[PDB]
Structure 1
């Protein structure tokens, strides 16, 4: 197994570097040769602006 793009969790969810609205981000992702758990973070982009995308912990 372990395809280079894989998800765990419910059917229809946000993968890596895809914008998340506070939930709806996949349970686990196979990227970089491991299973990383994903989460919804808001990263800095400009003066007092931040785009919120799914990023691993």
Structure 2
């Protein structure tokens, strides 16, 4: 009921800004005044090194 930073999905849910691996993110999280979906993106950190994190879309 938009009580806090709260997320809906299955068990084993990995929240926003937490490291993920190929589909171990969640369906949708209420994080910044809206409900936003989440994929498992991979960012940039240093030369030729990616660090993968659940990100909103």
Same fold (TM over 0.5): yes
Question: Where do 4+ consecutive residues of structure 1 move more than 4 Å?
Answer: none
| Shift of residue 5, structure 1, vs aligned partner | 1.4
- Provide Cα deviations, 1:18-49, integer angstroms capped at 9, x if missing partner: 00011110100001100000110000000000
Q: Is the Cα–Cα contact under 8 Å of residues 3 and 30 in structure 1 kept in the other structure?
A: no
| Shift of residue 8, structure 1, vs aligned partner | 1.2
Number of aligned residue pairs: give it.
57
Consecutive unaligned residues of structure 1, counting only runs of 5 or more, are none
Q: CA RMSD in A?
A: 0.8
**2:53 & 2:3 partners in 1: Cα distance?**
22
| Shift of residue 3, structure 1, vs aligned partner | 2.1
TM-score by length of 1: 0.92
Consecutive unaligned residues of structure 2, counting only runs of 5 or more, are none
What secondary structure sits across from 2:39 in the alignment? strand
